[PDB]
Structures are given as structure tokens and as C-alpha cells.
């Protein structure tokens, strides 16, 4: 699935769950 890291430190979009899941770590630590 595609997801959008529209968060207040990124404003990015990622055409894969693996690419958002691996990136979301950088917004948890
Ligand atoms: Zn992001």
C-alpha cells in the first residue's frame, strides 16, 4: 500500500508500506 509521511518534519510520500515503515522510525527516534 502507498502512504504519505505528511508529518511536520517531512512532507514526503512513499509508494510502499516498507518505505514508510522504515522511515517512520526516524519520527519515533
Ligand atoms: Zn516523514
Ligand 1 centroid, distance to 1 Cα (angstroms): 16
Q: How many domains does the chain have?
A: 1
Q: Could you tell me the residue range of the domain that residue 16 belongs to?
A: 1-29
Number of Cα atoms under 13 Å in the Cβ half of residue 4? 3
Dist CA 23 CA 15 (whole Å): 12
Ligand 1 centroid, distance to 18 Cα (angstroms): 13
Ligand 1 centroid, distance to 26 Cα (angstroms): 8
| SS3 labels along 7-29 | CCCCCEEECCHHHHHHHHHHHCC
- Give the pairing type, strands 3-5 and 12-14: antiparallel
Method used to solve the structure: NMR
Residues 6+ apart with CB under 8 A from 29: none
Ligand 1 centroid, distance to 4 Cα (angstroms): 8
Amino acid at each position: 500500500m502507498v502512504y504519505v509521511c505528511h508529518f511536520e518534519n517531512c512532507g514526503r510520500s512513499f509508494n510502499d508500506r516498507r518505505k514508510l515503515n522504515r522511515h517512520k522510525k526516524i519520527h519515533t527516534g
